[PDB]
Design a protein around this ligand. Sequence first.
Ligand SMILES: [Mg+2]
Length: 519
Amino acid sequence: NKKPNIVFILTDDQSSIPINKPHSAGESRPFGFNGDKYVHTPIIDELAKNGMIFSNATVSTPVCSASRYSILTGRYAGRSKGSVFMKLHPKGKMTRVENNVELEEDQDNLAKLLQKAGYKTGFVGKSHIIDHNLLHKQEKQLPPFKSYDKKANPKDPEVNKAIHHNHEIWCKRIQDFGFDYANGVYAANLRELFNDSINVHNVEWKNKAALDFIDQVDKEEPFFLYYSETIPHGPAPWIRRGGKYPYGLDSNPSFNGEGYDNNDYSYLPSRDKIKEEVKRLNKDVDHAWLTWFDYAVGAVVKKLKEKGVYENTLIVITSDHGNFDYEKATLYEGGLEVPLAMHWPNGIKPNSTYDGMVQNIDFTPTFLELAGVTKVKDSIDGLSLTNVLAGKEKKEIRDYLFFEIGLARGVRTKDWKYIAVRYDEASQRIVDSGKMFKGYKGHDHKLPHYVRNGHLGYYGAKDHPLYFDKNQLFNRVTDPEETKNLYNINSKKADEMKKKLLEKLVTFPDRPFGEFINK
Ligand SMILES: [Mg+2]
């Protein structure tokens, strides 16, 4: 009654950048409210129109684990004290953040804090931020997990049992980090299941898990639901093969992250009907997966209404980071920029917009304020958005944004972006040796990628001539596509931006970075 419910709905690798042509040529599309004219997302568009659209939402680290970490903590990913992260980055060494950060079992996170405030907390979908040591055991199918062949048939009773068993372990482990419920979970991505048949997205499976959570909330108790999609992450649902979409709408709805099960999803359209509707509206059939999702969000809104809690629920729709033009795990705009809308009938006026710089670190301090939490242990980097949400604040709430990905750090203002890349000791030694780096599919390279992941580095560098430039300065008014390095043309401005970067770097104890902070 006094505390609003929060439903946080997150897609995976979905830029806000619209694709202004009928064939998207291997790119994701954003929602209709982001300006894509080729999609059909009416429920989500109406939620956005009847709430607040943020046109300059960013993430501090544009790669899955790091973005998710920040979302659920309010802190920069470079502050993680996760077990794997600290083994890679002992005190006194620079950090190289990628998919290697996790929630710490004895530190604050949003879910733990909301539980202390009296919220029932629920988790559905993709994690990527819990127990990376256990993730390694999942990938290798080591105890406590059970093993199966990559080509195994999940209808096979012994195989189905193994995959179900592995899914139950993650449900239990996720609830050690502040959740009262966890179901429809993925430890990481579809890849890490190592099974061809279940290497498919399943909107319905996770949606039913979400609705089951909402059903079990007592009507007078506040709740928080973290609803984390796999879509449209690789293998992308839009991939057309033999006239079909085998990773999305034409996959078997019986295959899911827990194996095989014939569940009743008749409260959603059939997958065929989804495709039929998009084709009838002369919208892009490759991206019918967005309408598939729209209906799932529609079922959530229907359930909230039926329970009489819709008007006092804050629904957030966003993505963890972009992947436009292979700019995932870079500090270019196709990684940083994400869709963001917020809908809350009793707290946000409709037809609202905010164009100031906001960041994923802002979600936790915002929700904490709405939940009446005033005492936290771990310092928060983000800012509460509640004055923006209430329509009181129409100015910028910060002078600049900070970013970090692997060997790269960056800052941006409204009009300028600065990126610095500085090498770890191991990379620097290979560079000194004159030997090339062993690359993805034999694409060896002279200089390090920002990240250790050679697949991401290969794709991020392939059509980006400036990728390896150690100092990059872009004017966002004369060069929105970031094709012209002004570092040597505007040295005074570069120095001004370096000051802003240093102000953020010095807040990470025992973390050097090139000549900014010496080892
Ligand atoms: Mg992602």
